[PDB]
Amino acid sequence: GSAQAVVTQESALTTSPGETVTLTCRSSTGAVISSNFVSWVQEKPDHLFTGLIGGNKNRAPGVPARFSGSLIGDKAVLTITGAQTEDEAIYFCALWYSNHWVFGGGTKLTVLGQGGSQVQLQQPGAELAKPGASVQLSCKGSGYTFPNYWMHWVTQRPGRGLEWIGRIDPNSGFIRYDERFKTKATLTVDKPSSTAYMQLSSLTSDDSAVYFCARGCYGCIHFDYWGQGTTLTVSS
Numbered sequence: 647g648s649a650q651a652v653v654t655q656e657s658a659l660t661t662s663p664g665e666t667v668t669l670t671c672r673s674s675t676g677a678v679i680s681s682n683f684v685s686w687v688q689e690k691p692d693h694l695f696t697g698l699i700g701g702n703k704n705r706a707p708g709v710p711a712r713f714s715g716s717l718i719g720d721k722a723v724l725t726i727t728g729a730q731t732e733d734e735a736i737y738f739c740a741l742w743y744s745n746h747w748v749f750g751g752g753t754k755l756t757v758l759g760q761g762g763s764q765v766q767l768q769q770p771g772a773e774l775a776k777p778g779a780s781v782q783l784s785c786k787g788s789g790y791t792f793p794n795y796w797m798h799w800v801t802q803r804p805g806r807g808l809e810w811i812g813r814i815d816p817n818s819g820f821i822r823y824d825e826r827f828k829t830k831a832t833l834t835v836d837k838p839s840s841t842a843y844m845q846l847s848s849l850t851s852d853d854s855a856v857y858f859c860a861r862g863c864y865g866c867i868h869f870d871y872w873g874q875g876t877t878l879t880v881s882s
């Protein structure tokens with residue numbers, strides 16, 4: 647059974663500078679295992695995502711050393727050893743399940759005591775389209791070798807969590823769609839302009855959301871770098 651695969655995280659945690667924080671990530675299918683190749687990502691205001699950990703335990707370059715990831719017993723764990731005020735954020739884990747990624751629901755971390763990037767993924771800020779129509783979203787990679795990375799697409803509906811849409815390999819053309827989005831999204835890419843595209847079809851008000859692109863590749867820190875997100879509003 648994996649058609650109901652659900653990833654669970656703590657609702658909220660509170661810390662302060664110099665404390666240790668433990669965040670966990672559990673799978674409904676059994677123990678979290680090495681094959682789940684877990685990523686941890688951080689959401690700051692407004693819709694600003696950064697990948698912290700990939701491949702269960704690999705810290706992304708540039709991420710502070712106080713962040714570490716591991717598989718401990720049957721869960722994935724992100725530890726912040728010596729929290730800082732800038733760590734106040736929502737933390738999501740993501741698990742690989744055979745042919746799709748599943749995000750956990752996120753943990754809101756509060757830190758008491760409050761008070762350019764080489765790689766860039768470039769998305770337009772906003773789009774509006776009518777119900778029943780389709781729309782094109784774009785994501786241009788800058789400052790890295792675009793064909794050497796897959797492009798993931800992810801959405802966040804208002805007030806809610808992350809949902810994986812699919813990914814495309816620019817080098818081979820291979821596409822994966824999540825079952826949730828295989829009739830909603832269509833992925834294409836253009837290598838000479840380093841641009842990934844996603845067409846969203848048969849729009850409805852449920853499709854009003856922020857849509858992100860993010861990098862990945864086999865064995866890489868999936869979701870290391872993210873576009874800023876395009877806000878789509880579906881309205882007459």
Ligand SMILES: O=C(O)CCCCCNC(=O)Cc1cc([N+](=O)O)c(O)c([N+](=O)O)c1
Nearest residue numbers: 683701742745813822862863864865866868
């Ligand atoms: O221990 C070590 O480093 C050696 C083992 C490295 C395992 C790396 N796994 C992934 O990168 C996860 C993943 C695999 C895929 N696959 O295998 O087809 C995908 O297609 C896919 N995706 O996003 O679509 C994602």
